[PDB]
Amino acid sequence: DQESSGFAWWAGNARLINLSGKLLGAHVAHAGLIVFWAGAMTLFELAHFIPEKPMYEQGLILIPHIATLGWGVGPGGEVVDTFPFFVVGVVHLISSAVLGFGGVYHAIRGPETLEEYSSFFGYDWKDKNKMTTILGFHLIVLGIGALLLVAKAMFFGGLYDTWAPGGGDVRVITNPTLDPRVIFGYLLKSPFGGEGWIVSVNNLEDVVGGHIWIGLICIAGGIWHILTTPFGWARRAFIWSGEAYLSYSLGALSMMGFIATCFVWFNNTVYPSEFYGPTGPEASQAQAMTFLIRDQKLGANVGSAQGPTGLGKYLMRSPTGEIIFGGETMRFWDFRGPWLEPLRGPNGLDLNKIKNDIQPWQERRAAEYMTHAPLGSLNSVGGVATEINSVNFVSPRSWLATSHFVLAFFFLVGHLWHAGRARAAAAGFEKGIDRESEPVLSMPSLD
Amino acid sequence: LPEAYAIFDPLVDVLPVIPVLFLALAFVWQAAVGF
Amino acid sequence: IPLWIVATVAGMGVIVIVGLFFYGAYAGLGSSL
Amino acid sequence: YPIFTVRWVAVHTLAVPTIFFLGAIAAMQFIQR
Amino acid sequence: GWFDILDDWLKRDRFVFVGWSGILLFPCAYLALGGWLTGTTFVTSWYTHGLASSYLEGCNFLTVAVSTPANSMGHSLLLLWGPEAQGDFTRWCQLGGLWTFIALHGAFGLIGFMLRQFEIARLVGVRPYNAIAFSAPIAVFVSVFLIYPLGQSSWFFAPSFGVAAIFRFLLFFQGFHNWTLNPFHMMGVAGVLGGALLCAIHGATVENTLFQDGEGASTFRAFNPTQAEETYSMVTANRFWSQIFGIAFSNKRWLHFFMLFVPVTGLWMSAIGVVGLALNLRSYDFISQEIRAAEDPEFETFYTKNLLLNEGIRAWMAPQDQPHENFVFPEEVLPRGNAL
Amino acid sequence: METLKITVYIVVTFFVLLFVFGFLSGDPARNPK
Amino acid sequence: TITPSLKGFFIGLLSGAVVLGLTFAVLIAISQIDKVQ
Amino acid sequence: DWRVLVVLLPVLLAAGWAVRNILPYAVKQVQKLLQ
Amino acid sequence: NLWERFCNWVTSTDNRLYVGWFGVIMIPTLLAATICFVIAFIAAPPVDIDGIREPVSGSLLYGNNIITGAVVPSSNAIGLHFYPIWEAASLDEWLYNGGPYQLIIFHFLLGASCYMGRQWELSYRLGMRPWICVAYSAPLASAFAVFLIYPIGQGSFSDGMPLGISGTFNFMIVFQAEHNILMHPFHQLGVAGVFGGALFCAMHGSLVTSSLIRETTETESANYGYKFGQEEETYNIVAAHGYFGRLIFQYASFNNSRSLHFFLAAWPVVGVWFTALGISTMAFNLNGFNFNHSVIDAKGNVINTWADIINRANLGMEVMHERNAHNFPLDLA
Amino acid sequence: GTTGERPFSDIITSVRYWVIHSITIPALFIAGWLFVSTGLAYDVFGTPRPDSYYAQEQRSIPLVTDRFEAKQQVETFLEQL
Ligand code: CLA
Ligand code: CLA
Ligand code: CLA
Ligand code: CLA
Ligand code: CLA
Ligand SMILES: CCCCCCCCCCCCCCCC(=O)OC[C@H](COP(=O)(O)OC[C@@H](O)CO)OC(=O)CCCCCCCCCCCCCCC
Ligand SMILES: CC1=C(/C=C/C(C)=C/C=C/C(C)=C/C=C/C=C(C)/C=C/C=C(C)/C=C/C2=C(C)CCCC2(C)C)C(C)(C)CCC1
Ligand SMILES: CC1=C(/C=C/C(C)=C/C=C/C(C)=C/C=C/C=C(C)/C=C/C=C(C)/C=C/C2=C(C)CCCC2(C)C)C(C)(C)CCC1
Ligand SMILES: CC1=C(/C=C/C(C)=C/C=C/C(C)=C/C=C/C=C(C)/C=C/C=C(C)/C=C/C2=C(C)CCCC2(C)C)C(C)(C)CCC1
Ligand SMILES: [Cl-]
Ligand SMILES: [Cl-]
Ligand SMILES: [Fe+3]
């Protein structure tokens, strides 16, 4: 009841702030929901999956994650056996029942507080030692999880690699990149065009390598936070309360969600186009390729063909000179993909390779990706807005990019919400202004 | 789904919505306690 | 009759009927098919 | 309490046709061209 | 006396107040709302527009409309007993009679509602500024649904009552009147958006300058409607906005009047400009720009680009949006850039 | 050009360092109660 | 003479006069039964 | 035609059924009014 | 200490304008964006926004009035690449390709983000509750949507909203041609947010002005009945609620001022949040509802609705936007 | 204060209400259904059925051209079906 805590029913989970047993319960109960959805969604996707269709023509976002990890697929992304998808769903689903059972138990049946039950699980938010210790344990868990990805790539079948010679395939990662100048060079590239920050990672070696690195970084920091207490400069620079830590993570979860958006929109390495459909830049570049191949077959000389604007119709230069695809796709010349890189010489697209070396599988790939561009209506009509009904399709990339920008934006709002409140609760005016000691009434007047 | 489990493929169509219902139940419950 | 029961069943009636309208949007008149 | 009032009339001129209309709109989902 | 007896009953304190204004308001409002609901569910637009527009035909909530009567009806009142329907309910529906029915009963409903605000204000003891402010909705409705089509060839070019139909209206007004360029609409934008701003910012300011009058962390309980003290701090809210923005309100009465003034003023300005568009008296062009562009083919602004878009709208939508014109544009006259 | 790039890089560094070091110099304590 | 539209005009006139009549008839009656104190 | 009576039938039944469940409680209301 | 004096003045509550640490970024970035905007609006030369060597004039001195003038977005040849002054061979090349646009929008987004933080900050220094900045997040997100987020998803700052009155309308029109944003429920909620906010703003102002308590004569303004900082409320909430509850019915009215003012904040902010999100998700080409040819007759003839009339208009914008820039038949950029 | 009618809470809670309304709400709902399932809604309002928008060989839309003989023009359209 609201008279006991201060918080109303719509803010009822704030009554959990200093009840560690119930708070543990809700948390473990929530984690079951995530794992539940993961397993449930997978089985739904598998019950609706058709192997003869590409995954991206079928509204699948999880099976693509599983196949990128190397389970279920063969060369060029073709699904060869669906039993590994089945396992991933069943196991998550079965586990969620466990997470649910404990979560509900701690919520309504276990002891409401832990601090009198055990001195190890109990915690006071203002206790900077115990908090860094819990942080340390979880950092250790995160490090292990990042190493499980390494282990799957190096010791347990490998990963799907769209860049693999002969066409993408599952491949075991023998030489992860450990060179800090490469791994942390990604963390220092520009976010802007032609650079890409971490989103530009375009080889499994660099992926596997970076995970070895944060895997080690995390475990070390975990050990470091278990053994130390926060220094004095950190003590006076932060707010030490449950809501304060919740806000710090909302900001982080927000930053991560934006980054996830850009990753699935631009990157076709850890999001294989074989599974997720082409990217935006890719499908546009694929369109230009398709018409280059068609017109050249008719007898056009695509290097010297001038276009209406005077620029080249099929081929122009970039601002740094590189031979790129022409037309409005000029904006997409930073695109890189395995169907197009064979035509790339050192100066950009090689006119001789365009004339003599285009292979049927490339023409097929360009046409497929041109007519599967991530463009569609909310009710999944495929194409520009002016398209008539016929094609039921929205790219998984659109679906994943749009949702996680929404989640990211709202979690940034969440950060601003709980941050300011944490600051006001600690200072003692989160409930409003004391009439008998109004601060402004004691400051001097601006004029 | 493997055919030995084809009997549940109606049940699979519903499962992913179960987490949403959990959100709704918290309102049934607060309605039952009069908020 | 407890109101919380009336609240849940009415909404449940609402959710069903809305779901039937969205359902029809993919079949029969106005389905594009 | 009285049973029929100005309110009574007001709720029934909105509500009676609403349920009637929802019924008609319900059946429309099963019209095939 | 019977008049004072009927006044006693109309002005009774009930759940839904009636009043003298109720004799006009309720039947007209109920009939406007009932007519819209009736038509969007059952009534076509196949003979007026060539359009489907009912739930019964396949439309969803975004595409149902009570559509306007065909251009050939002119400004006919389209009464049920009038000369076009001649008392046939079926034909009246097929001819667009629900459109005028709704617009006219709606117009009179709005009169009844504004009279209602007057009637209740006088009985309760308050000044009548709420009814004054409702002038702006009435001015908007009158200019867009009555004056604008009265200026044009027929009720056909009024807005049809529907969600997507309203969107088409918006798009017609860009392609044909270049309505975005009209400074009277610009003043409306600034009063609508500036009203949203004042609504958001005044609500936040009060909620974030509250005094602490309870001990609960949900701060709503700490207000009693019968209390005498302000519930938030005008002094503190003033210093904050003084130091953040430069200027701050210091007078609560002027602040609330200003919240009336801004969006009311802006809707009235957009009505004025719609009155101009009734006569095709548009802000369509700037003569100086057209003289330069006709003599200098390298001159290109965003103004000249918008006109290319307006010309594309007009040629591509007119054959089906104005079907009484029997327009037939062979492909080669359609304006279009390369490729598309 | 390069002189400008270096000039702006120094300017930006300067203000960014004012920001981090200002918000570390004991911000929570700067409040009225 | 009385054209079809002029006949319609009276149709509408009497309809409206009937509607407002039944309206005010019923409203006066209710007001007489359920008076105030 | 026959369709009209098909449609009005439930409403007539419903109205009559409601009339019968409310009738003792209404005639007391009117009786209370006549004062 | 000298650094402590500086910090004491940065954070002072006695400054006519509050500076603060957020302000140490805000002031220079806004001043830079403002000065460059003023200069480019008046004086910039034509900019080749569509990267097809067809430059678009936007400044006053080049034949624009207040209505047609814009700072033109940077070239499509640039795309999402960063393009400060030093990346250009000369000021002349920078102006031709749209440099001032990036300079302005990036400084502005940084400056307005810190404006939001400044709002939390002074509120904390004053003993206030902290959420005014959460409300300001709704227009800030909207600005982020049209200057930054929508260029990212489309792949070029050249699809950013021009800094100009007509340029803005060119943005709305091309957007509707490409994404059908009128048929998108997130823009509809934005309409419901600004219309509703206008309505409620109008309502609250008329209701409070209506309930003002007589304190003045007729030969003076009713406003002089309120004095800055009186403890008595200046209007009668009970009378105002008495009125408005009778206008509709009593339970549809607010008798709690805090509950009413919270509603005043939440309705426009949420709706603007969603419309920011609508621009931000149409950036990734998740478009408004498409009902084109949705209704069909028994033979198979198309039976148009109003959606199909919206499409004919969308088509006419489509084939005329960027009239020389397309060499291939699908609009994928 | 309270105006005088019976609270809606006590009404949708009371047993008498749901005795009455578990019949009436379904009756109207079934009534609405039958209004469409019998095809009555088509003829009352004149809305074409999926086979009554054109004749078997026609793509011209039956648009009303004349104001005063319009009632007859619509009926000359329905006959050509
Ligand atoms: C993810 C959602 C989530 C979770 C995990 C929790 C969890 C919790 N809430 Mg919160 N809450 C939520 C959403 C959530 N809430 C929402 C959305 C609202 C708004 C309506 C609230 C409003 C709210 C209020 C107002 C309060 C709480 C409180 C609580 C705590 C005690 C609840 C209680 O007494 O239940 C009692 C209810 C029951 C005993 C009924 C049964 C409930 C269980 C969980 C059903 C489980 C079903 C499941 C299928 C069983 C699995 C079995 C297993 C073998 C697999 C608990 C830790 C309370 C608190 O803080 O107390 C100090 C409190 O006052 N919540
Ligand atoms: C990030 C999450 C995410 C993403 C990217 C997808 C993406 C997809 N899902 Mg999946 N799904 C999700 C979550 C997600 N889903 C969840 C949580 C559930 C449980 C209900 C499901 C259940 C589910 C099913 C059962 C199916 C899909 C399917 C699909 C596809 C079609 C989506 C569609 O048409 O939606 C329609 C679009 C909407 C319903 C719009 C919703 C808009 C939301 C409500 C806005 C919310 C805004 C904000 C959060 C609200 C708070 C604001 C407040 C704080 C102010 C698509 C590939 C379908 C498919 O093709 O499968 C093969 C399918 O059948 N999903
Ligand atoms: C984060 C999860 C979490 C946490 C912090 C706690 C904490 C606690 N639980 Mg709870 N519990 C949990 C999950 C959790 N539980 C789950 C999931 C279940 C359902 C299976 C239960 C079921 C449960 C019961 C039935 C009881 C408790 C009790 C306790 C208390 C005593 C535990 C003890 O001494 O363990 C000592 C340590 C061990 C027994 C060894 C644990 C070895 C683990 C499981 C190995 C696997 C680790 C691996 C990382 C897990 C991966 C999970 C996956 C989802 C990623 C303590 C306060 C007791 C209590 O409070 O009684 C009053 C009690 O009776 N818990
Ligand atoms: C989940 C991860 C996590 C969390 C929450 C914490 C939390 C904490 N750590 Mg720990 N730590 C972690 C992981 C984490 N650490 C790991 C994995 C390591 C091993 C490398 C360390 C190593 C470490 C050390 C060595 C120290 C801490 C300390 C701290 C405390 C102060 C942090 C601080 O001031 O940050 C604020 C960050 C700054 C002031 C840095 C300056 C500003 C930077 C440059 C901003 C850049 C952001 C920008 C957007 C760019 C991002 C992308 C890219 C370019 C980098 C705090 C309790 C301190 C303490 O008191 O320990 C006892 C301390 O000295 N941590
Ligand atoms: C930033 C974008 C923006 C903004 C803020 C506006 C703002 C405005 N536009 Mg503009 N407009 C825009 C962009 C924008 N427009 C663009 C890009 C175009 C294309 C060129 C248009 C095209 C356009 C047109 C065509 C019109 C406007 C009009 C308006 C005004 C409408 C005001 C209003 O509330 O009417 C709403 C209507 C009313 C308030 C009338 C009264 C309604 C009553 C009170 C309703 C009662 C309902 C009842 C209770 C029952 C309902 C039940 C039902 C829901 C079930 C307003 C000033 C209108 C105008 O200027 O009118 C004078 C107009 O006709 N705009
Ligand atoms: C809990 C769900 C939150 C949803 C998003 C946030 C909604 C409100 C955000 C408005 C911020 C306005 C600026 C400052 C506004 C401001 O200052 O607020 C002040 C006001 C009162 O604050 P208190 O200090 O009393 O309470 C906040 C905490 O202190 C808890 O006590 O805050 C609230 O009441 C929050 C209500 C939470 C419940 C919100 C649910 C409403 C949304 C429901 C879903 C709508 C979906 C629509 C779909 C189309
Ligand atoms: C705290 C709380 C809460 C929450 C709760 C929760 C969140 C819970 C969770 C729970 C959970 C989370 C649960 C789970 C469960 C699961 C399960 C129960 C499962 C089972 C499964 C199975 C049995 C499987 C089967 C199968 C197989 C084996 C194969 C395939 C097919 C099938 C599917 C048949 C709420 C909000 C209400 C409020 C109150 C308080
Ligand atoms: C895995 C991987 C990778 C890698 C990754 C990495 C290596 C990462 C790292 C990362 C990192 C290394 C991160 C970090 C971050 C940081 C941050 C995020 C920060 C934050 C900060 C803050 C938040 C602060 C704040 C403040 C200020 C500003 C002042 C004073 C106050 C305060 C404290 C509040 C790669 C890409 C190779 C590839 C792929 C895979
Ligand atoms: C015309 C006319 C008339 C009138 C009639 C009337 C007056 C009618 C009424 C009618 C009505 C009165 C109807 C109603 C309807 C209703 C409806 C049809 C509804 C529906 C609803 C829904 C569907 C819901 C939805 C929703 C919402 C909105 C909220 C939440 C969400 C949801 C989705 C649940 C007369 C004969 C005198 C004369 C001649 C002409
Ligand atoms: Cl254009
Ligand atoms: Cl092109
Ligand atoms: Fe106020």
Curated annotation (Swiss-Prot), chain A:
It is a multi-pass membrane protein. Belongs to the PsbB/PsbC family. PsbC subfamily. GO terms for cellular component: photosystem II; plasma membrane-derived thylakoid membrane. Gene3D superfamilies: photosystem ii from thermosynechococcus elongatus (1.10.10.670). Residues 58-97, 165-218, 276-410 are lumenal. The chain crosses the membrane at residues 35-57, 98-119, 142-164, 219-239, 255-275, 411-435. One of the components of the core complex of photosystem II (PSII). It binds chlorophyll and helps catalyze the primary light-induced photochemical processes of PSII. PSII is a light-driven water:plastoquinone oxidoreductase, using light energy to abstract electrons from H(2)O, generating O(2) and a proton gradient subsequently used for ATP formation. The keyword DNA-binding does not apply. Keywords: Chlorophyll, Chromophore, Manganese, Membrane, Metal-binding, Photosynthesis, Photosystem II, Thylakoid, Transmembrane, Transmembrane helix. It comes from Thermosynechococcus vestitus (strain NIES-2133 / IAM M-273 / BP-1). Its main location: membrane. It is found in: Cellular thylakoid membrane. Residues 1-34, 120-141, 240-254, 436-447 are cytoplasmic. [CaMn4O5] cluster binds at E341. Pfam families: PSII (PF00421). GO terms for molecular function: chlorophyll binding; electron transporter, transferring electrons within the cyclic electron transport pathway of photosynthesis activity; metal ion binding. GO terms for biological process: photosynthetic electron transport in photosystem II. This is Photosystem II CP43 reaction center protein. It comes from the Bacteria. InterPro entries: PS_antenna-like, PS_II_antenna-like_sf, PSII_PsbC, PSII_PsbC_sf.
Swiss-Prot record, chain D:
One of its GO terms (molecular function) is iron ion binding. Heme binds at H12. Its cofactor is heme b. It is a single-pass membrane protein. The chain crosses the membrane at residues 6-30. One of its GO terms (cellular component) is plasma membrane-derived thylakoid membrane. With its partner (PsbE) binds heme. PSII binds additional chlorophylls, carotenoids and specific lipids. It is found in: Cellular thylakoid membrane. This is Cytochrome b559 subunit beta. The gene is psbF.
From Swiss-Prot, chain E:
Its main location: membrane. It is a multi-pass membrane protein. It is found in: Cellular thylakoid membrane. The D1/D2 heterodimer binds P680, chlorophylls that are the primary electron donor of PSII, and subsequent electron acceptors. It shares a non-heme iron and each subunit binds pheophytin, quinone, additional chlorophylls, carotenoids and lipids. There is also a Cl(-1) ion associated with D1 and D2, which is required for oxygen evolution. PSII binds additional chlorophylls, carotenoids and specific lipids. Chlorophyll a ChlzD2 binds at H105. PROSITE patterns: REACTION_CENTER. It comes from the Bacteria. This is Photosystem II D2 protein. It comes from Thermosynechococcus vestitus (strain NIES-2133 / IAM M-273 / BP-1). The gene is psbD1.
Curated annotation (Swiss-Prot), chain I:
Fe cation binds at H204, H261. One of its GO terms (biological process) is response to herbicide. One of its GO terms (cellular component) is plasma membrane-derived thylakoid membrane. Its EC number is 1.10.3.9. The D1/D2 heterodimer binds P680, chlorophylls that are the primary electron donor of PSII, and subsequent electron acceptors. It shares a non-heme iron and each subunit binds pheophytin, quinone, additional chlorophylls, carotenoids and lipids. D1 provides most of the ligands for the Mn4-Ca-O5 cluster of the oxygen-evolving complex (OEC). There is also a Cl(-1) ion associated with D1 and D2, which is required for oxygen evolution. PSII binds additional chlorophylls, carotenoids and specific lipids. It is an enzyme of class 1 (oxidoreductase). The record marks Y150 as: Tyrosine radical intermediate. The chain crosses the membrane at residues 21-42, 100-121, 132-152, 181-206, 262-284. Belongs to the reaction center PufL/M/PsbA/D family. 2 of the reaction center chlorophylls (ChlD1 and ChlD2) are entirely coordinated by water. Herbicides such as terbutryn, atrazine, BNT, diuron or ioxynil bind in the Q(B) binding site and block subsequent electron transfer. This is Photosystem II protein D1 1. It comes from Thermosynechococcus vestitus (strain NIES-2133 / IAM M-273 / BP-1). The gene is psbA1.
